[PDB]
Design a protein around this ligand. Structure first.
Ligand code: CLA
Ligand code: CLA
Ligand code: CLA
Ligand code: CLA
Ligand code: A1EB4
Ligand code: A1EB1
Ligand code: A1EB1
Ligand code: A86
Ligand code: A86
Ligand code: A86
Ligand code: KC2
Lengths: 171, 193, 228, 215, 177
């Protein structure tokens, strides 16, 4: 599994604990888990940075008298969302993952959907890169940006739970 | 080595591997050897910590004077929680310097425990063979050769006892600190901890 | 061999009752120590309890009547007539300490493997005779006369006579334990033993605490009493 | 083992195997059917034993009957039929009782001590409610729980089987009786027979300790 | 194990009720004997000092430290009270000489008692005049056994003195001070 995607940077194939050398047949599940984590992390990092200088106009509920511009930046912004809005967000995520972008087949654990690639959701109406060098570069860029976004989103979460902002002190 | 041929097992959890999270079979042998070394160091540190916390909570201080002007009982007047901070700065410096030297010397030895050594077998003389450094031949483990009258089977049985006691000591020292921090968490630990 | 000997001794103690073990302590491995050692410990402890109870009954009679030695000794501090629970209440504290120490020395000699192997004997748990006392013949400095037979008039006894003596010893020991705790129970709670009502006065101190109501600290030693 | 449930005829004729809520198959935690009914048998026997002991303890606590030299006799001498004198006990003693029960069950259900005795787990082909003896870590420990004096060291298999059937039946009836007592203590409901005038533990019977312990 | 030390008053056998052997090797038994011998000799010196000073003795004639105001007779007759009256320079000198002597004893015997050797045979500080330079090997074992017995008795002696000083009326022959 040393020649697969993600083993491109200065470290080559970097598996210290050896998850995929102990179980080489478990690489596809780990790749799907990493790809979902990376995509959620890119969305989270972009939301963290963009909510600081961009805010929607108008109200959020028009019943709890809560504005888009009144939610501060972060965890407290998710606090001030009304319970119906939280229910709708969870319904959107559940419908988005259980049926539309389905990362897992199988009864309980979820292997990989058929003979597709790990993280090969959406389908049909999605850009399919030909020219395998370009496809390999695009996929490796996706994976590496996902990993960097995981670390960044974790750091901003660590900052937000001990401050009022995700910006570290001194910045 | 593999987690199957390892001295943890124990008779309490049915005589098999306790691992309910599947950690032992999800990683390679090098990670398991690192985990065994970390568990053994944790257990020994926790045994020392549990005995020291019990002694400091019973207010059993040394007879004499810690620093010139500072009594052992003056530091141990409060509980073990407010005790390390009452130590003079030079004494904490010397203790942590000796611990630093011990860790560096035991890690800089021939066959590392992840590269051919035995995880948890600390070398008897960590400060021997270092160029420009002379230390007496006091052994780190057993300065008195207590485990020289022991056979291989007795050594294996006492290694099993060491592992079980280290696990119990980790639970106990975390129990002591949590019982001080969160009163009423541990029913036996009354006030002076 | 263990339980068979136990049945035989119980049958000789009483043909009617025979083996009476309702608790079944003769089947319990007391320290994971087989059957032989457990029954040896049980027989040795029963014999020791019976001997101590017989001696205690005689001593209780002697102190309740008033039977002092004479002068100078620890009897001089004990008042003339205080009942037997209170004569271990007025002797000096060091007298009680030295008495208990000498009893412990006797127990240790009765258990020390040098003394037992001197006169060809093993431990009662390891396969020796329960209740046997090795004579003295290892104690560095020589001892004048033994403890079981001080004047040695029982050296001509047949083994059958010795067995009947052991059976009588055990029966008398059991009955003396019962009598002595009749005395001790009447000294604590009234109306327990109907026969002993009004004879034995009540006692307030604890019987199971040796130095409770500890005695005084007096020096009865004269001539060169540098320990004032 | 599904047809091994024909022992309910021996427990009581006429009313044979009676399972309306058909728990006979109902795979628990993905285990097999025989393991599920082994769990059911062991849980039933444990509930019956605890119910019988709780019934006797209920009678004792209602009729006072305290220890002679116990210094934890500071509880009130009147006392609710039972749940207040449990509540009047200090919390450390209740915790020690609960930890004792947990230690003894963990001893009962360890497969090392069970197979050393010669008998497997109750969901792996073993008799439910066995409780093996003490091959403990260095601890002589005289007297196991079951027949410590040895009242049934020798016994025919017919007598043991009859005792097992009697144990299950008396356990069921003691579950019914003990919850009749607890019902007459709280929102009476057992006006038939009135159960013999039990005051009323206004509180919850299912509320151990005086403090909530945030759990 | 076999060693020296045993003799009469025990039956010609080893004395250890609590075990404290059968967990000991040759190295551990050598440490046991070295610690026993050092404790024994220190205790013999300690009883010979406390007994001489407290009971009687002419005491050392002179002054003890010409500058500070102390006299040999001004130290007193008590053991612990006179030790505190010894000046700090004298205490540090005694402790430093003892430490230098023992560090050189550890670094001077090349078959170390924990690595061979004979326990209790420290270099120097024994007979400078060679009183035992002609003694037979059989007689020397008797003297070593006598040293061990007298040392154990002296250990009990120093602890009796310490107990009598700290908790009064213990050790009944020793007085209240
Ligand atoms: C951090 C300390 C530490 C470490 C490094 C280990 C490491 C190990 N243990 Mg171990 N153990 C510990 C603490 C630890 N243990 C404690 C405290 C107990 C008592 C409950 C046990 C009880 C125990 C048993 C009974 C067995 C092992 C076994 C093993 C080995 C295989 C399991 C494995 O791969 O897990 C790798 C482990 C880790 C990578 C550590 C993960 C630590 C997580 C992050 C902490 C989670 C704790 C959580 C907060 C709950 C804490 C509450 C608690 C205080 C009550 C491995 C060498 C098995 C063995 O030796 O078989 C050969 C075995 O049978 N352990
Ligand atoms: C995690 C380990 C640990 C830590 C961090 C501490 C920390 C502390 N201890 Mg402590 N202690 C420990 C374990 C520990 N102890 C153990 C295991 C014991 C039982 C022996 C004690 C007994 C103890 C006493 C009696 C006293 C302290 C005191 C103190 C405080 C002052 C520092 C000091 O002089 O320590 C000294 C600590 C030790 C000497 C413990 C020995 C630790 C080493 C690693 C073991 C050496 C092995 C060997 C058996 C030692 C004997 C050598 C032999 C040649 C005689 C400090 C808060 C003092 C206090 O209350 O505050 C002033 C004090 O009077 N400790
Ligand atoms: C501490 C004293 C003591 C000891 C160690 C023994 C020991 C023994 N007796 Mg024994 N016995 C004693 C006193 C003692 N006896 C007394 C006082 C009597 C007269 C009542 C008897 C009458 C007797 C008979 C008739 C027989 C034995 C036999 C035996 C042997 C086997 C039975 C057994 O397991 O122990 C016996 C059981 C115990 C010692 C139980 C221990 C005491 C418990 C734990 C405390 C109970 C206290 C409680 C207040 C008592 C309430 C009494 C009442 C309400 C029932 C064993 C060597 C058998 C034999 O002959 O073998 C040679 C036998 O058949 N005993
Ligand atoms: C199984 C349920 C149960 C529970 C939760 C309790 C709970 C309690 N009992 Mg209790 N008890 C029970 C059953 C129970 N009992 C039974 C069945 C009996 C009759 C033997 C008693 C007889 C009893 C007495 C005489 C006293 C208590 C007391 C108490 C309270 C203090 C704890 C204590 O010392 O317990 C001690 C209770 C036991 C050791 C009995 C439990 C052991 C098993 C289940 C039954 C006995 C087995 C066997 C016959 C043992 C021989 C007798 C032996 C106890 C010496 C506590 C509220 C004390 C109290 O009221 O304090 C305020 C008190 O004085 N109990
Ligand atoms: C002078 C020099 C003398 C020689 C040196 C000797 C030397 O140093 O040897 C040291 C040595 C050795 C040795 C040997 O070599 C010797 C000497 C001879 C040789 O043949 C054999 C060996 C063995 C090799 C071993 C050391 C072992 C140790 C320290 C083990 C330490 C182990 C601590 C624990 C378990 C802590 C437990 C804490 C607990 C349980 C806390 C807790 C609780 C409670 C309060 C209890 C109850 C509560 O529950 C409730 C609510 O009630 C739960 C909990 C968790 O809150
Ligand atoms: C219709 C919905 C489409 C959704 C998908 C989408 O929109 O994807 C768009 C997309 C590409 C694409 C496309 C496809 C996806 C291939 C297909 C699409 O066409 C269709 C519909 O098929 C269009 C197309 C071509 O565009 C790519 C999006 C990529 C995205 C959003 C990547 C975020 C990285 C963030 C990082 C690396 C953060 C690092 C954070 C780091 C390194 C930190 O440490 C943070 C830091 O704070 C810390 C902790 C402390 C501070 O002091 C300092 C800083 C601030 C540094
Ligand atoms: C100068 C040489 C003599 C000195 C003597 C001495 O100094 O004091 C002596 C003294 C008083 C005195 C003094 C005088 C003598 C009157 C005069 C002197 O006046 C001066 C000089 O000034 C000193 C003074 C005041 O002290 C009083 C001595 C009193 C004494 C000797 C009291 C023994 C009790 C035995 C008991 C209680 C038995 C328990 C029961 C026992 C031991 C057992 O049941 C043992 C046993 O169960 C075991 C363990 C296992 C079983 O298998 C076997 C048996 C069943 C057997
Ligand atoms: C085979 C081998 O060699 O191993 C040996 C080693 C060893 C150690 C001796 C063994 C053992 C046995 C022992 C002694 C095991 C000890 C176990 C022990 C003593 C475990 C304490 C847990 C305390 C907890 C979890 C506290 C939780 C606390 C929680 C969850 C909370 O925060 C409470 C709360 O959250 C709730 C619940 C709801 C919330 O709304 C409110 C809050 C936040 C307040 C073995 C395994 O038998 C054999
Ligand atoms: C409720 C009620 O009404 O009941 C009443 C009844 C009653 C009776 C009034 C009560 C009582 C008190 C009781 C029961 C007292 C019992 C006392 C008892 C049973 C006391 C044993 C002494 C044995 C001795 C001294 C052994 C000597 C042993 C000797 C001298 C020897 O060893 C020597 C010897 O053996 C050799 C070595 C071998 C052989 O050559 C034979 C001889 C002898 C030469 C109670 C308590 O109030 C209860
Ligand atoms: C309207 C109506 O219906 O009535 C009302 C009112 C009323 C009547 C009050 C009610 C009630 C309450 C009731 C009926 C409660 C019943 C409680 C019940 C039936 C409680 C069993 C305890 C069993 C024990 C303790 C067993 C000990 C067993 C022991 C001690 C053994 O060792 C057994 C032993 O076998 C061994 C192991 C070995 C053998 O060799 C020897 C023996 C045999 C000795 C109702 C029914 O709820 C409702
Ligand atoms: C105060 C304590 C005490 C009392 C009150 C007491 C009472 C009686 C009675 C009257 C009821 C009889 C009839 C009797 C008889 C025998 N006693 Mg006892 N005896 C006491 C002490 C000892 C001691 C210390 C020993 C001993 C023994 C024997 C033997 C020898 C058996 C044999 O050699 O086979 C016989 C026949 C020795 C022995 O070995 O017992 C295993 C032994 O060591 N006895 N003993």
């Amino acid at each position: 599994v040393e020649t697969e995607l993600g083993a491109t940077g200065p470290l080559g194939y970097w598996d210290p604990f050896g998850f995929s050398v102990r179980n080489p047949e478990r690489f596809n599940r780990y790749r799907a888990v990493e790809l979902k984590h990376g995509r959620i992390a890119m969305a989270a990092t972009t939301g963290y940075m963009v909510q600081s200088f961009l805010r929607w106009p108008g109200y959020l509920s028009t019943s709890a008298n809560i504005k888009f511009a009144d939610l501060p930046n972060g965890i407290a912004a998710f606090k001030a969302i009304p319970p119906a809005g939280l229910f709708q967000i969870l319904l959107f995520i559940g419908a988005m993952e259980a049926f539309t972008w389905r990362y897992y087949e199988g009864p309980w654990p979820g292997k990989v959907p058929e003979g597709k690639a790990p993280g090969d959701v959406a389908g049909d109406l999605w850009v399919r890169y030909t020219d395998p060098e370009e496809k390999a570069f695009k996929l490796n860029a996706e994976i590496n940006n996902g990993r960097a976004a995981m670390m960044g989103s974790l750091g901003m979460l660590m900052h937000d739970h001990i401050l009022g902002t995700w910006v570290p002190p001194g910045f | 080595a593999l987690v199957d041929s390892m001295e943890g097992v124990g008779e309490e959890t049915g005589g098999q591997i306790w691992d309910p999270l599947g950690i032992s079979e999800a990683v390679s042998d090098e990670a398991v050897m690192w985990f065994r070394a970390s568990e053994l160091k944790h257990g020994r540190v926790a045994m020392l910590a549990s005995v020291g916390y019990l002694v400091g909570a019973a207010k059993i201080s040394f007879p004499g004077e810690l620093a010139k002007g500072v009594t052992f009982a003056s530091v141990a007047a409060n509980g073990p929680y407010q005790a390390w901070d009452a130590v003079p700065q030079a004494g904490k410096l010397q203790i942590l310097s000796i611990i630093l030297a011990l860790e560096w010397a035991t890690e800089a030895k021939k066959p590392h425990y992840m590269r051919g050594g035995v995880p948890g077998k600390i070398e008897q003389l960590p400060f021997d063979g270092i160029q420009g450094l002379w230390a007496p031949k006091i052994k780190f483990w057993d300065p008195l050769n207590f485990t020289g009258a022991l056979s291989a089977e007795q050594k294996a049985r006492k290694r099993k006892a060491e592992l079980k006691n280290g696990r119990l000591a980790m639970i106990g020292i975390i129990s002591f600190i949590t019982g001080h921090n969160l009163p009423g968490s541990v029913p036996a630990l009354d006030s002076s901890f | 061999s263990a339980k068979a000997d136990l049945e035989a001794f119980a049958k000789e103690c009483n043909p009617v009752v025979g083996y009476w073990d309702p608790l079944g302590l003769a089947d319990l491995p007391l320290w994971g120590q087989d059957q032989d050692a457990v029954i040896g410990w049980l027989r040795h402890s029963e014999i020791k309890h019976g001997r101590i109870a017989m001696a205690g009954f005689v001593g209780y009679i002697a102190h309740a009547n008033g039977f002092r030695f004479g002068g100078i000794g620890p009897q001089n501090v004990v008042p003339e007539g205080a009942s037997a629970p209170e004569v271990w209440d007025s002797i000096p504290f060091l007298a009680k300490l030295q008495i208990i120490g000498a009893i412990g020395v006797l127990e240790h000699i009765s258990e020390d493997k040098n003394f037992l192997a001197a006169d060809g004997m093993k431990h009662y748990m390891r396969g020796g005779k329960p209740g046997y006392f090795p004579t003295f013949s290892a104690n560095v400095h020589p001892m004048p006369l033994n403890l079981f037979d001080p004047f040695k008039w029982s050296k001509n006894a047949s083994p059958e006579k010795k067995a009947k003596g052991l059976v009588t010893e055990t029966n008398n020991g059991r009955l003396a334990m019962l009598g002595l705790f009749g005395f001790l129970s009447e000294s604590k709670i009234p109306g327990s033993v109907p026969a002993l009502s009004g004879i034995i006065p009540s006692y307030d101190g604890d019987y199971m605490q040796p130095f409770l109501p500890t005695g005084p600290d007096t020096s009865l030693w004269t001539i060169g009493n540098l320990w004032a | 083992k599904a047809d091994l449930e024909a022992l309910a005829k021996d427990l009581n004729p006429a009313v044979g195997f009676w399972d309306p809520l058909a728990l006979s198959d109902y795979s628990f935690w993905g285990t097999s059917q025989e393991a599920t009914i082994g769990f059911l048998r062991e849980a039933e026997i444990k509930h019956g034993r605890i119910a019988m002991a709780g019934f006797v303890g209920y009678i004792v606590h209602s009729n006072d009957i305290r220890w002679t030299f116990d210094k934890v006799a500071a509880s009130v001498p009147t006392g609710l039929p039972a749940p207040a004198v449990w509540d009047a006990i200090p919390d450390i003693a209740k915790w020690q009782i609960i930890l004792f029960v947990g230690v003894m069950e963990s001893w009962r259900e360890n497969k090392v001590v069970l197979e050393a005795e010669g008998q497997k787990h109750y969901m792996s082909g073993g008799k439910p409610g066995y409780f093996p003896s003490f091959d403990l870590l260095p601890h002589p420990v005289p007297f196991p729980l079951f027949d410590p004096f040895g009242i049934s060291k020798r016994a025919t298999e017919e007598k043991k089987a009859k005792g097992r059937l009697a144990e299950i039946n008396n356990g069921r009836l003691a579950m019914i009786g003990l919850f009749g007592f607890l019902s007459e203590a709280t929102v009476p409901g057992s006006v038939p027979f009135l159960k013999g005038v039990v005051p009323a533990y206004t509180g919850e019977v299912m509320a151990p300790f005086t403090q909530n312990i945030f759990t | 194990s076999d060693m020296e030390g045993t003799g009469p008053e025990t039956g010609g056998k080893v004395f250890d009720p609590m075990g404290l052997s059968k967990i000991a090797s040759a190295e551990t038994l050598a440490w046991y004997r070295a610690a026993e011998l050092k404790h024994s000799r220190v205790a013999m010196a300690a009883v010979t000092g406390w007994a001489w000073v407290s009971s009687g003795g002419p005491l050392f004639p002179g002054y003890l430290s010409v500058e500070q105001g102390v006299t040999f007779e001004s130290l007193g007759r008590d053991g612990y009270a006179a030790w505190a009256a010894v000046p700090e320079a004298g205490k540090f000198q005694i402790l430093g000489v003892i430490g230098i002597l023992e560090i050189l004893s550890e670094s001077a015997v090349k078959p170390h008692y924990m690595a061979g050797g004979t326990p209790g045979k420290v270099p120097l500080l024994w007979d400078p005049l060679g009183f035992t330079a002609k003694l037979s090997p059989e007689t020397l074992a008797r003297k070593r056994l006598a040293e061990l017995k007298n040392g154990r008795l002296a250990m009990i002696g120093v602890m009796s003195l310490v107990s009598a000083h700290f908790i009064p009326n213990s050790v009944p022959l020793l007085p209240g001070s």
